[PDB]
Amino acid sequence: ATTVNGGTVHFKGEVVNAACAVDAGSVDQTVQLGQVRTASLAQEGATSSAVGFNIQLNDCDTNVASKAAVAFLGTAIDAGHTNVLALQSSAAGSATNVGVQILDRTGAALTLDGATFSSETTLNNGTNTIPFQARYFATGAATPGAANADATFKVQYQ
Amino acid sequence: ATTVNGGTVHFKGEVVNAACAVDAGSVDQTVQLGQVRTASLAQEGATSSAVGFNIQLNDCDTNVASKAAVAFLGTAIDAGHTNVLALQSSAAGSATNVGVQILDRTGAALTLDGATFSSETTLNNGTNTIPFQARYFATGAATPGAANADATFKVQYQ
Amino acid sequence: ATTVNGGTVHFKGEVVNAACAVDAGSVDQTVQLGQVRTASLAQEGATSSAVGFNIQLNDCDTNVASKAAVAFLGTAIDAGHTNVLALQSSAAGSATNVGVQILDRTGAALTLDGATFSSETTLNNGTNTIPFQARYFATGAATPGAANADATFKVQYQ
Amino acid sequence: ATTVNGGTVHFKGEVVNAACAVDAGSVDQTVQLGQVRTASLAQEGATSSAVGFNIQLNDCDTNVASKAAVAFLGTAIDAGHTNVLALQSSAAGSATNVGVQILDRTGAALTLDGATFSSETTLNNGTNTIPFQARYFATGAATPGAANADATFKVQYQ
Amino acid sequence: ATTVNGGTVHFKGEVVNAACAVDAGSVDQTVQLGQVRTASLAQEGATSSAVGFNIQLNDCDTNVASKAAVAFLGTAIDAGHTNVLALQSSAAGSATNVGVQILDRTGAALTLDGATFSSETTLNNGTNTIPFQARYFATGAATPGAANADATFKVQYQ
Amino acid sequence: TVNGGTVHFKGEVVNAACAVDAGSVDQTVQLGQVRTASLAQEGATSSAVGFNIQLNDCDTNVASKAAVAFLGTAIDAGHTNVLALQSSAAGSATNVGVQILDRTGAALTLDGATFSSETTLNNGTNTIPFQARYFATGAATPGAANADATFKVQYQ
Amino acid sequence: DNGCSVAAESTNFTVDLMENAAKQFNNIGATTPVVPFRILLSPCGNAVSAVKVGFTGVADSHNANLLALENTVSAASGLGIQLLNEQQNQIPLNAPSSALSWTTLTPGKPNTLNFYARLMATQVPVTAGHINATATFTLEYQ
């Protein structure tokens, strides 16, 4: 009977010529690092506790590539810290002298350039979960404020 | 004391004469299908897995209409495949020989002409959820690239 | 003395004119089916073992309604099998020729149309528990992959 | 080797002599009200449900100002209804006898003239969030059509 | 060998100058109130049962502050009921004459003002948990609908 | 009626490795709102807002790395990396300018020829991150702080 | 005096469209970032009120509203120069004087009129090469 205007739906995806495919819940995810005290980040090199996230690969094939690595691209805090990611919340109220650091399964910080790939993990025929961690890193004496960032990643199969 | 120009708020909505009102999250949604390999889409009629989404209708009255059906409208990928939706061509680097296919609650693909309503779902007073799905359909041998798409739906109450 | 901001709390609920109220843990629950060998799902009609889940109804009044039934709604695997729920997961790495069947108190699979209701269970004042089961159903020869699915239920009181 | 023209980027912002700074996501925001029924808005004074939108104030210094208020400005639907906001004109057809009514944290409508500020909210140091609600208000018997609106707001710091 | 685009990751957090840090699971949490019946909320001032939610503070230093209190901010329902939260889901299909109400560790309703703090809880070094409850308060004869409400809290240290 | 004059047009269509996304060719970056207390002295910078230039249909057999060079109006001599603000009818902020950083956190020179750090490319979709701040050349003044800068992509 | 004079700078000037990615023209109608150019009208009298600026030249075969490109051995094909206005609205080539849009001026002062130019694909894929083109601008005074 009555026909209504309804609404709209947008589909977001990508087709890749690769051994695996990145999961729908992993292509875009939000990681809640929580909240950190300025006392925990009080001097150069101080790190907070790490919140663990992971990237899921579906439809993997070991006859095409038996190992996978992930490379991260983002804005470094400065030229002296190429593995720390700057905070880009807004133009006011962001924290100072602190940036998010990303660690692979080896517990080592990753360079944010898109060309330094992490430690290669062996794949299964099927679902594979690659674990990562994210913490806060003080490039000085941290100050109160919002601490949000954003980084892109790419996957290399060998 | 100090009055400062803050900003602007834009309110978007629609008054409709119907039995139900589409939810604020369903009138405009962004479903993320995720990545898919070209091996799964290497031949005509090859379909990837189907991600699930749903449309929520609030304030339903069964004294004026006890069933609902949803019809989607979009750009068909070609004349032959009228139920396969074309990919956004507003930019370069899009996947070829592949489109997105919307499935009703019966599991069958829906013709995207705006006048073919899906299977009727019985309604109850209150909140109603109608489940749909979206997958990838290969009209040939797929090639890598972005696979975003878009559709607009209308609701019929009986 | 020192006031900071903590975060956000979102409350989700529903007010219903009924005889029983669905429990807070039953309005949204995750069922862990486990994993099944593809040898068990070798041909069409092959079924796996069943896990059990319950819907709990609180604050029941037998002076309003003495019996309760539950109907499920979801996307069927195909037109032939209307009682077999279709796997959703992501757009890659999902099991082929496999769905999930929901069985009611009597051990009979329920069609997922939203209007076919299960066997009525007699209600008592207070707390009632309606048991259901979930298993896998092979529409062909199963293939490895994720086997997640979703459905939404609806309660009728008589 | 191949320098190609890329395009342009426009940066929008504002420097203010205030005790707080309106968030980047709050300076211009889009509140999706959803859909409403003509039956729900059938007489003068009949109001729909309310959606919630928040105004965030980053980098707040309480030594400068301890409380904040927000005053909205927009075109009124009639002279009699000064707290109701007129809808924009639409090519397909806009709804009549209905507007948008903004409520503050006390659940009271706000006069949309730019001089009547809402109830004062106590601010902390740093991130602050002021909740508001948008609601449909029927000035008569509402008719179907798109119901879009816009309102500019200013912030006062005591 | 094969390098493909993976996607993006968003990191969210905040650096605070406080004795404790709000947990990653507490900075943004969802409480499932369940379903309630209009028969229960059939009169003004009639309440429902209460569900419990906790706010967890990490890395607490009792030398800095020995007590903590929490204040909640949100849209009230009426001028008379300042401690009852207003429902905000969409522009249609919400319960009428009812709102969420938050209770501190003394079992008393909290004014949703941003300045009336809850009963102080003594803090020990390390992890602390602050209990809270949420129920439904009816400002009249309640009507069926979806009852979702949101609030933001501040934590005061002494 | 008047013959006027002749306008010549020169240019080249080259085989570039990628193509700037239709979103990225013209994008508006909502920096937000800043306080004069934050921008209170020479060299004082506000917090950064991130924006991305997305490239599509990239081919690594044509070019394996990409860089972006920005061109804009400098606020002053000696502040070539600080972009001048546009003028508004009500008024614009003085002693404030938009500053565009790089993927290494270093502000770019808005000359149109000082390219940014080169990012390696993968076949398909690539994304180049950038950030924007408010750089103060003195005591800031309230007002609208809008600016605009063009950019060019060097595939190497 | 309702008539203005074209300065030596605006008598003959070249608009540099720079290098353009052949991949940017995915489909017919794909454009490029606009390149601004200006026409200085000075001196002007105290009676000038409006000027309509029209563009004339050899039009493209596929699109009659696009300025054509010279066909040589090493010239790009499948493209056409789209000339816009101050508000980025299309100004058709060889359009009649009634079809144009009046532009306001300021009497007694050197007035600068700003327009834009870009490339629009008429064929896919767009071939590579150079883009040499000439147009003649005419002025209708009011």
Residue numbers in the entry:
A (entry chain D), B (entry chain C), C (entry chain G), D (entry chain B), E (entry chain E): 2 to 159
F (entry chain A): 4 to 159
G (entry chain F): 13 to 154
Task: Give the exact sentences the study uses for this entry.
Uropathogenic Escherichia coli strains use filamentous type 1 pili to adhere to and invade uroepithelial cells. The pilus rod is a helical assembly of up to 3000 copies of the main subunit FimA, terminated by a single copy of the subunit FimI that anchors the rod to the assembly platform FimD in the outer membrane. The assembly platform FimD in the outer membrane of uropathogenic E. coli is the catalyst of type 1 pilus assembly.
We determined the cryo-EM structure of the transition from the last tip fibrillum subunit, FimF, to the first turn of the pilus rod at 3.1 Å resolution. The structure revealed key interactions between FimF and the first three FimA subunits (FimA1, FimA2, and FimA3), which are well-resolved and clearly identifiable. In contrast, the preceding subunit of the tip fibrillum, FimG, appeared flexible and was only visible at lower thresholds, highlighting its dynamic connection to FimF. Specifically, predominantly hydrophobic interactions were found between FimF (complemented with the donor strand of FimA1) and the donor strand of FimA2, while the interfaces of FimF with FimA1 and FimA3 included both hydrophobic contacts and hydrogen bonding. Notably, superimposition of the first three FimA subunits revealed a conformational shift in the βC-βD loop: while solvent-exposed in FimA1 and FimA2, the loop in FimA3 adopts a different conformation that enables interaction with FimF through five additional hydrogen bonds. Importantly, the chemical identity of Lys35 and Gln36 is conserved across FimF homologs of other chaperone-usher pili at the transition from the tip fibrillum to the rod. However, Arg38 and Gln36 are shifted by a few residues when aligned to sequences of other FimF homologs, consistent with the substantially different orientation of adjacent FimA rod subunits compared to the FimA-FimF interface. Thus, these differences in the interfaces and the simultaneous interaction of FimF with FimA1, FimA2 and FimA3 are likely incompatible with a FimA-like orientation within the helical rod and thereby facilitate the transition between the linear tip fibrillum and the helical rod architecture. Models of the tip-to-rod transitions in F1C/S pili, F9 pili, P pili, and Yfc pili show that all FimF homologs point upward in a manner similar to FimF.
